[PDB]
Amino acid sequence: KINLNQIYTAKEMSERIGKNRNYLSQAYRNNKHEILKNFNYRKIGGTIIFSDNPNNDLSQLITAKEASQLLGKNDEYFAHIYKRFPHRLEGIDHIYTGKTLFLTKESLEVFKKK
Incomplete structure (x- = not known):
């Protein structure tokens, strides 16, 4: 992981x-x-x-924008949530760097289930 x-x-x-x-x-x-x-x-x-x-598989990283789009939401969906309601991403692996929020393919699946 x-x-x-x-x-x-x-x-x-x-x-x-x-x-x-x-x-x-x-x-x-x-x-x-x-x-x-x-x-x-x-x-x-x-x-x-x-x-x-x-051993970190960088292909597991995805941008917040891509994650937003794979859920059928506006480009800013995860970005907007992260900024205002960051506890909604508790238990959803993510990292903010280079002024960009990233999720993982697995954490997006966790979020879809939540």
């Missing part, structure tokens, strides 16, 4: 490895695969997300 405490943007991950904040974003733009091959990352909507834990 994905550990959402180990999920960062490229800029934060670049600082976690002791590099300038643009290091991984520049590697991704310039196709520096000999660097990138060593990292667990994924493009998820408009954010390249990284984890320092190779």
Whole structure:
């Protein structure tokens, strides 16, 4: 099960490895695969997300907007709930980073059941 405490943007991950904040974003733009091959990352909507834990399956992450749409709701459905009624997402694994709220495929299923 994905550990959402180990999920960062490229800029934060670049600082976690002791590099300038643009290091991984520049590697991704310039196709520096000999660097990138060593990292667990994924493009998820408009954010390249990284984890320092190779066992986190980043394909389980989904944006709040995508989650909203898979429920047949307005794009801002989960965003609006998170902001005003954050306890509605108790027990729904989520993480906010890079100014973006993310759920998981499993936590969306939990929410649908709730």
